[PDB]
PDB file of C-alpha atoms (C1' of nucleotides) in Angstrom:
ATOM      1  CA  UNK A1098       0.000   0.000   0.000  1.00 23.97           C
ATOM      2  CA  UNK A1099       2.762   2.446   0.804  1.00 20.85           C
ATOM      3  CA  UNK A1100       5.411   1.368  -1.431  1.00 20.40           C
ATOM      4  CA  UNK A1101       8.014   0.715   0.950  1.00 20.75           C
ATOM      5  CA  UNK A1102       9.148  -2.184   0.093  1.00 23.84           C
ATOM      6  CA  UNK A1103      12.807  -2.354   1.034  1.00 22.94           C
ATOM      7  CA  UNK A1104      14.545  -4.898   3.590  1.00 20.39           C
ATOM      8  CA  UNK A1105      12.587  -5.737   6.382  1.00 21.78           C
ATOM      9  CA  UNK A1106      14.404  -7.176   9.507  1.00 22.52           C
ATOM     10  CA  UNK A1107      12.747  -9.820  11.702  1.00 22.55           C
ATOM     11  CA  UNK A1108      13.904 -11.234  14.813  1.00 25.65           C
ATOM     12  CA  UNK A1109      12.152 -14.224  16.379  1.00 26.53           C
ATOM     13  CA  UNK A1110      13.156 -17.208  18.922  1.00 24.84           C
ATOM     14  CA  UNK A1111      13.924 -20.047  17.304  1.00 26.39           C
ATOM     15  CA  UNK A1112      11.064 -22.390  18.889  1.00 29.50           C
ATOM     16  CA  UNK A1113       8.237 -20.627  17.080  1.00 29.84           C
ATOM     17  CA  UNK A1114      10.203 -19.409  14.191  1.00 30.69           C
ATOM     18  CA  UNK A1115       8.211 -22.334  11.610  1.00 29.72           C
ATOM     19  CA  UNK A1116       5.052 -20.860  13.111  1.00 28.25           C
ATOM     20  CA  UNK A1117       6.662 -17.476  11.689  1.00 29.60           C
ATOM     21  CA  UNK A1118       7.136 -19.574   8.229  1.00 29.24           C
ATOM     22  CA  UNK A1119       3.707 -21.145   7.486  1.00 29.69           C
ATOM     23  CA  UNK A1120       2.932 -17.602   8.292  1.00 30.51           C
ATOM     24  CA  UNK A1121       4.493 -15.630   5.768  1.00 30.65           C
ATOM     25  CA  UNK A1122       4.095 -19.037   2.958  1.00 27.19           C
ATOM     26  CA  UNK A1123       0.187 -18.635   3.824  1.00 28.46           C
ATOM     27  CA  UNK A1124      -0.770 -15.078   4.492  1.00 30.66           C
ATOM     28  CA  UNK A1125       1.824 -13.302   2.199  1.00 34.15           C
ATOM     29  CA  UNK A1126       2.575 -15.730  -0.073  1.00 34.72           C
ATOM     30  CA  UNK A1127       3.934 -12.689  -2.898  1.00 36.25           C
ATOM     31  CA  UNK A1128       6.848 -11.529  -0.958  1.00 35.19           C
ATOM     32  CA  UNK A1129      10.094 -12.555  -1.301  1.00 38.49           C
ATOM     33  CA  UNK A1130      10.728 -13.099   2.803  1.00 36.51           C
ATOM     34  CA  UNK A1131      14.341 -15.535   3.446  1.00 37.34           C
ATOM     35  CA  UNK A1132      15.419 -17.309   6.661  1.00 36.58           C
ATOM     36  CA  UNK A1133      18.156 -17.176   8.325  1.00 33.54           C
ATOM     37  CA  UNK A1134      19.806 -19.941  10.295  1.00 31.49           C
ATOM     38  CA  UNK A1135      22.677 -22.601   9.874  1.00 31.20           C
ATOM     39  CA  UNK A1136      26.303 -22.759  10.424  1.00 31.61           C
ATOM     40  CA  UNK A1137      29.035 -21.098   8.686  1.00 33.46           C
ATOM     41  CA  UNK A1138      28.575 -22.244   4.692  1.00 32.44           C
ATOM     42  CA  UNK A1139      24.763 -22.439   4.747  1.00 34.06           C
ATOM     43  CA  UNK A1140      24.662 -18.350   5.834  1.00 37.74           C
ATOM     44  CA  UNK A1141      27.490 -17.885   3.156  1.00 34.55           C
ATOM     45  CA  UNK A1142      25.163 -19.688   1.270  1.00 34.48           C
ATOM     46  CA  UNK A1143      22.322 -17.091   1.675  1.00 32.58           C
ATOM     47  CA  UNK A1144      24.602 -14.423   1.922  1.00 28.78           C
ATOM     48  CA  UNK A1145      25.668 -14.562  -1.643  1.00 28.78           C
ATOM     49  CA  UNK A1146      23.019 -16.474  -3.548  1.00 26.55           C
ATOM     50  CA  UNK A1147      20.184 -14.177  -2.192  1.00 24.79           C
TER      51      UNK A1147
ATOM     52  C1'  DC B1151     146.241-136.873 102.827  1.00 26.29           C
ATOM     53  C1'  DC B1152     147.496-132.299 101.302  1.00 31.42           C
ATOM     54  C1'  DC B1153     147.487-129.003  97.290  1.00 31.77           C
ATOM     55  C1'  DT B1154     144.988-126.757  93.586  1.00 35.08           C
ATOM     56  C1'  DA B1155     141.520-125.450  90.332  1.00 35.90           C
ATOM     57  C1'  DT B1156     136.246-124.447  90.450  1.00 37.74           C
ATOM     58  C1'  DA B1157     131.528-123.075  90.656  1.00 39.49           C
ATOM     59  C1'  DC B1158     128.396-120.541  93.928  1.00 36.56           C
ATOM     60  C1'  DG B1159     126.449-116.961  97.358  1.00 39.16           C
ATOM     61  C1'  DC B1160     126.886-112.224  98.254  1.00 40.54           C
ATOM     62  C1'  DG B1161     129.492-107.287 101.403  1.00 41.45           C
ATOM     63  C1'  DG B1162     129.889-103.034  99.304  1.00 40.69           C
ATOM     64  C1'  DC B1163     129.091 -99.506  95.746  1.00 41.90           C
ATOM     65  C1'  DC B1164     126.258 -97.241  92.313  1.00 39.78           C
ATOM     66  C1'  DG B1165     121.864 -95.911  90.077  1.00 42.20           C
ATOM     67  C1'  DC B1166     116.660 -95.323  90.059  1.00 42.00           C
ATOM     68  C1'  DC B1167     111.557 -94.450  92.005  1.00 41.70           C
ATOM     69  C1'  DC B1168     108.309 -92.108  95.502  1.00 41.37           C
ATOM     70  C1'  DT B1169     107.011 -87.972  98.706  1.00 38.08           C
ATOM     71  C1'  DG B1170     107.648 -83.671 101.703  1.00 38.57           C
ATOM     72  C1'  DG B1171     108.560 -78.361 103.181  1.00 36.79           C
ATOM     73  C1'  DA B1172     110.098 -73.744 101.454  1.00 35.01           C
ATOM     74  C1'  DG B1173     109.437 -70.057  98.167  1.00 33.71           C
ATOM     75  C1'  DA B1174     107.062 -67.548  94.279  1.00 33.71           C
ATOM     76  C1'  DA B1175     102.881 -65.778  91.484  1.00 32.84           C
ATOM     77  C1'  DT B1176      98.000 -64.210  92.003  1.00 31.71           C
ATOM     78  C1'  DC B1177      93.487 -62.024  93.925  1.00 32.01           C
ATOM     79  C1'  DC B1178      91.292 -59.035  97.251  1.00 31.96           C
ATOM     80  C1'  DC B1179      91.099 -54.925 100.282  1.00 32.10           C
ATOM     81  C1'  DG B1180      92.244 -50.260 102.069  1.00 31.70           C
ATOM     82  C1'  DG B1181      94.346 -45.639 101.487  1.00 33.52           C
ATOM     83  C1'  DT B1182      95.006 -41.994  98.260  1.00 31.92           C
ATOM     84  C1'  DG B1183      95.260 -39.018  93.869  1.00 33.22           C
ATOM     85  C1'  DC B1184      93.078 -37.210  89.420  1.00 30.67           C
ATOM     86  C1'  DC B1185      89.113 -36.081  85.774  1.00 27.38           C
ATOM     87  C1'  DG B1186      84.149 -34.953  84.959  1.00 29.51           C
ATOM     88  C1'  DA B1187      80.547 -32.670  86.764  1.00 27.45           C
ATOM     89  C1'  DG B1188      77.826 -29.919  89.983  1.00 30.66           C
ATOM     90  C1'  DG B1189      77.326 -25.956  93.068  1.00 30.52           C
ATOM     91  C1'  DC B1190      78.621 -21.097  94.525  1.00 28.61           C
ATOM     92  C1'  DC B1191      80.152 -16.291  93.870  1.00 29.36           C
ATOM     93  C1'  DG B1192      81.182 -11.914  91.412  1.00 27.97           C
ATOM     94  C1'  DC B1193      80.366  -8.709  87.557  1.00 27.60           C
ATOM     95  C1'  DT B1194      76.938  -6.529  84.794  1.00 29.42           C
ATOM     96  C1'  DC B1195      73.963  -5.501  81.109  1.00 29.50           C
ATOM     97  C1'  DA B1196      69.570  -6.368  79.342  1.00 31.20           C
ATOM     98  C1'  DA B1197      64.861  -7.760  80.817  1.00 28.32           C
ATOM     99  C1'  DT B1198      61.356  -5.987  84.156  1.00 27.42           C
ATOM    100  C1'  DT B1199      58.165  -2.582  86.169  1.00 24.69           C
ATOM    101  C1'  DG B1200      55.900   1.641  86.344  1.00 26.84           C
ATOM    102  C1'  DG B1201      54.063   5.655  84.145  1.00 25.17           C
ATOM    103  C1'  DT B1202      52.854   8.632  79.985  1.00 27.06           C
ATOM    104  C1'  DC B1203      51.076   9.484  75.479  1.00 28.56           C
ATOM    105  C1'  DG B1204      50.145   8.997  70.511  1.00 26.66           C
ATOM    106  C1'  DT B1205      47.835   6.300  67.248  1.00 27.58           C
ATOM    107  C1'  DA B1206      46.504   1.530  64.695  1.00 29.51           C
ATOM    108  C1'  DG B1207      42.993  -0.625  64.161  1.00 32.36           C
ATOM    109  C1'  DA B1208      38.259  -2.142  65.509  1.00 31.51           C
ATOM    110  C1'  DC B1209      33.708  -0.529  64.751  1.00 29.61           C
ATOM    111  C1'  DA B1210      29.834   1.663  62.482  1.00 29.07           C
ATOM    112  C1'  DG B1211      27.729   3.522  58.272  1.00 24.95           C
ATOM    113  C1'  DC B1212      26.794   4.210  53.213  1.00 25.72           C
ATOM    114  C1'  DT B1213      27.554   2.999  48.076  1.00 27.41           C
ATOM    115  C1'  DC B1214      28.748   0.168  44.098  1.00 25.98           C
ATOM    116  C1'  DT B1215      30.236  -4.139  41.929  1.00 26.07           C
ATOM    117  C1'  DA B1216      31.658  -9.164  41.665  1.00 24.07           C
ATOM    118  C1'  DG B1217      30.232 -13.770  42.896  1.00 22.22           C
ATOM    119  C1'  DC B1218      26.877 -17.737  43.499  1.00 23.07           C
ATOM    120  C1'  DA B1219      23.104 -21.302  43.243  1.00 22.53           C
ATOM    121  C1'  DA B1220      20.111 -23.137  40.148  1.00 23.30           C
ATOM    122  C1'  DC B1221      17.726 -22.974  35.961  1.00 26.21           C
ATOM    123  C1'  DC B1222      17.156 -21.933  30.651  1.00 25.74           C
ATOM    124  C1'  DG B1223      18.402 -21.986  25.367  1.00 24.65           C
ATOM    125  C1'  DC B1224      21.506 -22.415  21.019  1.00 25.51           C
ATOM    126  C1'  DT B1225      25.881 -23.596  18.665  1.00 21.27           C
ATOM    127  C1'  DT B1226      29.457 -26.338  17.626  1.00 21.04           C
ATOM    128  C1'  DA B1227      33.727 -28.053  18.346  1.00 16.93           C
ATOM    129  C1'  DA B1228      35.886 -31.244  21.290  1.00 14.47           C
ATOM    130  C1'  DA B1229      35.786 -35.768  23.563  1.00 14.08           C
ATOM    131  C1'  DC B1230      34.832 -40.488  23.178  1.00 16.30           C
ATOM    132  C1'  DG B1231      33.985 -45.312  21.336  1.00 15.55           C
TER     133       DG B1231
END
DNA sequence: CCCTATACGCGGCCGCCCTGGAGAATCCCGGTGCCGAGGCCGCTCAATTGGTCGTAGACAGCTCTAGCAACCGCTTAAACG
């Protein structure tokens, strides 16, 4: 509605975090939200393939 | 019937076996001298006693920060089989 669609920052526990992700795959299905967990190479991974 | 050689016992001298009194070596006792140790005395200086005074530290009070017991949760690298 307001055009601001720039990066968006989320911070959630990790317990509830795939109640976060049905969430967003369900509700907003359009937007282009990413998680973010993992060890070293699978962050590297996001880091510069998204 | 008397002399003369002849075999036989043995007085005296020499050598060998058994026992006794005098002297010498040894152990014990008494008197005396020397070394280790204990007691006493003289000096003598440092511990003791008494008093005074300053202050070191105990005590109380207030403020701020580290530690501690017991629990959680996630990561991940180290320990273990």
């Amino acid at each position: 509605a307001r055009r601001q669609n720039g990066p968006h920052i989320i911070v959630v526990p990790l317990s509830t975090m795939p109640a976060w992700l049905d969430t967003f795959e369900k509700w907003a299905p359009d937007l282009n939200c990413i998680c973010y967990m993992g060890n070293q190479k699978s962050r590297d991974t996001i880091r510069e393939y998204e």
